[PDB]
Amino acid sequence: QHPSHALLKENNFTQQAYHKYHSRCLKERRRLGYGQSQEMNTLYRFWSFFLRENFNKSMYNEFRSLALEDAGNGFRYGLECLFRFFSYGLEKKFRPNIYQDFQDETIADYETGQLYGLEKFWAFLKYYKNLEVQPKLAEYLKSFKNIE
Numbered sequence: 779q780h781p782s783h784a785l786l787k788e789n790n791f792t793q794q795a796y797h798k799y800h801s802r803c804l805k806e807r808r809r810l811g812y813g814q815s816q817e818m819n820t821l822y823r824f825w826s827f828f829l830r831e832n833f834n835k836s837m838y839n840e841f842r843s844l845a846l847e848d849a850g851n852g853f854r855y856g857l858e859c860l861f862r863f864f865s866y867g868l869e870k871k872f873r874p875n876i877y878q879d880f881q882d883e884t885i886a887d888y889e890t891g892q893l894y895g896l897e898k899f900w901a902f903l904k905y906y907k908n909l910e911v912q913p914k915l916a917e918y919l920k921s922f923k924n925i926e
Contacts, residue, residue, distance in 0.1 A: 822844075822860075880902070
């Protein structure tokens, strides 16, 4: 199996294995450029699912930073995986710092003219079974009410 799947198997994550896998992913990105590495893409998906229960400040900051570099040049997959992590990760374990970040990246995504992040935020607030919202995102969400 591919490391992106084997490292998600229950109780099988190892540091030694993640380091080898992580390594070639960055080399492949550093070799082929933003949004051009299918191997790097497997790492975005691994991060998206892994951190939902398997959180790591180290991995999360990297995930976020690279996803935003890519998306700043038009390649959306990494950022799409990050919003999916935000929406489903916070449903499984609410972290206030990560909720604030979710707001921050949703606002930034909307103001670049996208709706993928805002819908994911709307989806979270709706299903999150239990929130204060930056009044700017508050108004953006009110206008989204005409869509979903």
